[PDB]
Amino acid sequence: EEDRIIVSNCLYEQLKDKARLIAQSDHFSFIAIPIDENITNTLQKMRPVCGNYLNAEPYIQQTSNRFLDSKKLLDKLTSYHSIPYPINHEAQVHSLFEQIDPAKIWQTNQHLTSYINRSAKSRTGVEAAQWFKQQFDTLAQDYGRKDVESYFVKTGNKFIQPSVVTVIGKDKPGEAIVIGAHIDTLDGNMPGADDDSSGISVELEMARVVFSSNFELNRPIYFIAYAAEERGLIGSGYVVQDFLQKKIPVKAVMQLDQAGYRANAKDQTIWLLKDYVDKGLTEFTAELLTRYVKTPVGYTKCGYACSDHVNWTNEGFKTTYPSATTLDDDNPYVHTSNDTLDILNLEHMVNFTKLGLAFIVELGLN
Ligand SMILES: [Zn+2]
Numbered sequence: 058e059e060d061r062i063i064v065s066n067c068l069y070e071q072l073k074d075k076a077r078l079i080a081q082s083d084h085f086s087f088i089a090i091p092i093d094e095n096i097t098n099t100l101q102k103m104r105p106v107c108g109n110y111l112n113a114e115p116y117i118q119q120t121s122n123r124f125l126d127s128k129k130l131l132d133k134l135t136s137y138h139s140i141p142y143p144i145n146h147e148a149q150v151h152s153l154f155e156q157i158d159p160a161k162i163w164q165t166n167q168h169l170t171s172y173i174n175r176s177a178k179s180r181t182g183v184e185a186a187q188w189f190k191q192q193f194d195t196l197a198q199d200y201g202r203k204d205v206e207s208y209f210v211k212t213g214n215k216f217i218q219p220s221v222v223t224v225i226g227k228d229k230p231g232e233a234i235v236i237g238a239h240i241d242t243l244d245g246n247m248p249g250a251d252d253d254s255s256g257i258s259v260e261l262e263m264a265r266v267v268f269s270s271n272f273e274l275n276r277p278i279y280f281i282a283y284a285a286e287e288r289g290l291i292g293s294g295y296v297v298q299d300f301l302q303k304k305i306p307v308k309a310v311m312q313l314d315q316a317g318y319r320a321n322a323k324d325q326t327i328w329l330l331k332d333y334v335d336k337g338l339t340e341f342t343a344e345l346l347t348r349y350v351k352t353p354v355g356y357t358k359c360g361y362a363c364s365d366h367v368n369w370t371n372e373g374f375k376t377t378y379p380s381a382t383t384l385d386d387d388n389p390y391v392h393t394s395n396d397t398l399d400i401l402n403l404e405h406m407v408n409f410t411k412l413g414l415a416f417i418v419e420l421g422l423n
Pocket residue numbers: 252287391
């Protein structure tokens with residue numbers, strides 16, 4: 058019934074009267090509040106000022122408050138401590154670039170954005186997840202790759218939309234590489250074109266290029282579609298917990314959230330996030346952009362519980378997050394009916410696909 062979530066004190070003061078305060082710090086509150094869509098609307102409306110929220114359930118799973126060290130939980134999920142990469146595979150990286158099929162990218166966006174919404178509560182939201190899984194399965198069957206796996210990861214008992222985890226090279230030795238994007242959107246009429254149809258499309262193309270590649274990787278590569286990112290990042294919460302339980306070792310994580318909108322349609326700058334990411338992995342991404350994508354490299358900052366990468370870094374995994382926009386010249390249309398297909402820049406997505414593939418090759422073959 059009640060959600061337990063972590064919010065900025067800013068957001069708390071807007072929710073006080075409907076919430077139970079469990080623990081509090083100078084900047085954040087750990088609360089219990091039954092999220093109805095009245096409260097959903099408050100969360101959405103205060104998000105630019107007060108930041109996003111983190112659903113704690115994947116970290117504490119129904120454990121009673123009496124048994125929780127609430128303050129340690131609150132401190133460790135609102136702070137982070139920081140934790141060299143070779144680039145020596147130019148021939149392979151260019152081979153993969155030459156196989157990028159921009160039309161196939163665009164087609165994916167057309168499909169996801171044709172749904173009325175992809176909400177974690179709705180039937181269409183469930184279809185989108187099932188669709189994604191089947192796109193992977195089909196691709197692996199089409200290129201006769203047995204070397205693979207795909208499964209749903211339940212979004213607890215709160216949301217019917219599951220996450221989808223896929224992997225190429227299940228039997229490869231070593232720490233894996235993870236690529237992720239979130240499949241979901243808000244309720245109502247939400248094409249969610251830039252708000253991660255884009256990210257999803259980019260990684261789907263990355264997967265397909267990898268299947269059609271002439272060389273194998275020396276590590277497993279995961280491609281993930283997170284459920285319910287628009288619900289306090291709870292989908293990737295469960296996914297990270299699933300990786301922890303299965304003891305899957307992971308060397309690097311890329312988050313693709315909004316990979317398709319340009320503020321100025323011939324800007325071509327790609328922005329890297331500098332908080333809640335690995336600085337080492339981020340400098341690496343910067344040099345891939347300069348060396349291979351030949352793009353200007355910008356930097357930006359994010360609010361609290363910005364996106365799924367946060368669940369990885371909270372659990373000690375190294376994380377990088379390339380983004381379409383800076384925090385000041387934004388996508389003004391995200392979370393509205395106007396996050397439409399026609400807002401997407403295909404050159405921009407192609408560049409994120411390039412970045413992703415260089416990432417996969419230079420880590421995948423060390
Ligand atoms: Zn969002």
